[PDB]
C-alpha cells in the first residue's frame, strides 16, 4: 500500500481517463484552475477532458440563472469549439452575473410599458408570463394574452361577468377566478372556455393548481380543494372553513396548504387529509398577499409590513418594514423578494440577508422602483426581469439584463 499516489496521472496511464475526468468534474472554477497548474499531465487531462465545457454544462443543468444566460446570450448552443473557448467563456459569464447583480442592487434597468387600453373600468388584477406570452386578467372581465416580444395583444377571452381577479396557466389550460364567484377553465392554446365551477357564494380571490389538484379561496370566508382528473372533469374534494373574513390568497405544495385572510391570520392545513394544522398570528392587520415554498412563507399585509415564517414551527423569521402603503402583492425566488404596494412602488429586498438574523433592518430593502401611477396588484419575476401589472391599466417589464 503506497503512501501517496497521483490519481490524475495514474488513471489515464492505465486507460482509465474517464475516472480522472469524473474526479476533476467535482472541482469548482478556482480548484479547476489550480488543477490546471499542478503539472502538465493534469492540464492535459483537463483540456482533453473538456472540463470547462463540462463545468458550464453542470452549471446550466443545476442553476436557472446559468440556464437563462445560456438561452439568452446564445453560448448555450455550443453545449450538449475547443476547450480554450469554454475556459475563456467562464469568466465572461461570471462578469455578466456580477453586472446583473449590480443592476439589481442599483436599480439599473430598462422598462417596457404595455398600455392595456382598457375600454371602461381600467385595471389589471393578475398576470403570469413566460418566454413567449403574458396572460393577464383585467377589470373589464376579459383575459388578455399579449406577446412577450412584440407586446401586441394576441388574444382576448370573454366569459366572466366580473373582474378577473386571479389566474394561473400551465402548458395545458388556464384557470381564472373572478368577482362573478365562478372558476373558469379555458384552453391555453385556442382560448375556448372548457369548464365553469359554480361553488363559491362570493368573489373567488385567489387560486392555485399543480400536479392535478386545485385550491380556490373566496370572499365567502371559504377554501375549496378540487381534484382535477381532466380540464373538463373537476371534482370538489373538500371545503375548508375556519377563517372569519375573506380569504385573499391561497398557496400549497405536497406538504401543506397555506391560506391568508383579512382576519389577520395565516392558516396551515394538511394537504393530504385537508386537516387544519396550525395558525400563524402576528400581522397587526389583514394579509393581502402570500407565497409559500419549501419551508418559507412570505406574506404582505395591510400593516405595510412583510413577514417571513417557517412553515413547520410557525415562528416569524423576519419582519420587513419599508412600504408606505398596503403590500398588495409579493413574490420571492432563491435570492430576493419583490413586493408591490398600493402606492405604485415596488421594493426589492435581499432574501438571504433577511433570513440572516444578524443583518440590520435598514440594509434589508435593496431597491425601490417607481414607475406605476396606481396600485400594484400583481407581479412575477425571475433572475433577469420583473413583470408587474397595476390599477393604472399598464403592464411593466423591468429588465435588469443589459
Amino acid at each position: 500500500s503506497m503512501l501517496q499516489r497521483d490519481f490524475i496521472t495514474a488513471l489515464p496511464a492505465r486507460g482509465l481517463d474517464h475516472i480522472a475526468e469524473n474526479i476533476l468534474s467535482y472541482l469548482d472554477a478556482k480548484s479547476l484552475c489550480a488543477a490546471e497548474l499542478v503539472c502538465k499531465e493534469w492540464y492535459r487531462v483537463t483540456s482533453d477532458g473538456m472540463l470547462w465545457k463540462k463545468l458550464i454544462e453542470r452549471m446550466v443543468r443545476t442553476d436557472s440563472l446559468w440556464r437563462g444566460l445560456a438561452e439568452r446570450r446564445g453560448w448555450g448552443q455550443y453545449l450538449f469549439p475547443p476547450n480554450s473557448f469554454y475556459r475563456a467563456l467562464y469568466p465572461k459569464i461570471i462578469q455578466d452575473i456580477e453586472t446583473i447583480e449590480s443592476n439589481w442592487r442599483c436599480g439599473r434597468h430598462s422598462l417596457q410599458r404595455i398600455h392595456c387600453r382598457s375600454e371602461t373600468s381600467k385595471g389589471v388584477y393578475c398576470l403570469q408570463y413566460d418566454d413567449q406570452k403574458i396572460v393577464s386578467g383585467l377589470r373589464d372581465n376579459t383575459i388578455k394574452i399579449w406577446d412577450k416580444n412584440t407586446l401586441e395583444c394576441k388574444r382576448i377571452l370573454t366569459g366572466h361577468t366580473g373582474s378577473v381577479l386571479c389566474l394561473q396557466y400551465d402548458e395545458r389550460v388556464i384557470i381564472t377566478g373572478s368577482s362573478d364567484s365562478t372558476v373558469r377553465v379555458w384552453d391555453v392554446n385556442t382560448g375556448e372556455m372548457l369548464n365553469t365551477l359554480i361553488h363559491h357564494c362570493e368573489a373567488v380571490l385567489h387560486l392555485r393548481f399543480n400536479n392535478g389538484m386545485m385550491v380556490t379561496c373566496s370572499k365567502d370566508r371559504s377554501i375549496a380543494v378540487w381534484d382535477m382528473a381532466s380540464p373538463t372533469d373537476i371534482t370538489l374534494r373538500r371545503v375548508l372553513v375556519g377563517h372569519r373574513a375573506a380569504v385573499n390568497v391561497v398557496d400549497f405544495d405536497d406538504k401543506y396548504i397555506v391560506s391568508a385572510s383579512g382576519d389577520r391570520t395565516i392558516k396551515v392545513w394538511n394537504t393530504s387529509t385537508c386537516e387544519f394544522v396550525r395558525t400563524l398570528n402576528g400581522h397587526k392587520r389583514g394579509i393581502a398577499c402570500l407565497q409559500y415554498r419549501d419551508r418559507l412563507v412570505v406574506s404582505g399585509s395591510s400593516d405595510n409590513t412583510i413577514r417571513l415564517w417557517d412553515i413547520e414551527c410557525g415562528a416569524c423569521l423576519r419582519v420587513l418594514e419599508g412600504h408606505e402603503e398596503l403590500v398588495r402583492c409579493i413574490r420571492f425566488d432563491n435570492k430576493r423578494i419583490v413586493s408591490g404596494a398600493y402606492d405604485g412602488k415596488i421594493k426589492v429586498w435581499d432574501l438571504v440577508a433577511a433570513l440572516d438574523p444578524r443583518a440590520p433592518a435598514g440594509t434589508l430593502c435593496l431597491r425601490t422602483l417607481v414607475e406605476h401611477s396606481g396600485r400594484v396588484f400583481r407581479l412575477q419575476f425571475d433572475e433577469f426581469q420583473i413583470v408587474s401589472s397595476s390599477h393604472d391599466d399598464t403592464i411593466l417589464i423591468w429588465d435588469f439584463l443589459n
Binding site: 388584477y125 370572499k219 383579512g262 393581502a288 398588495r328 396588484f377
Partner: peptide, 9 residues
Amino acid sequence: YLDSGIHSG
C-alpha cells in the same frame, strides 16, 4: 377604498 381582489373583516 379597496380593490375587488382583497377584502377585510
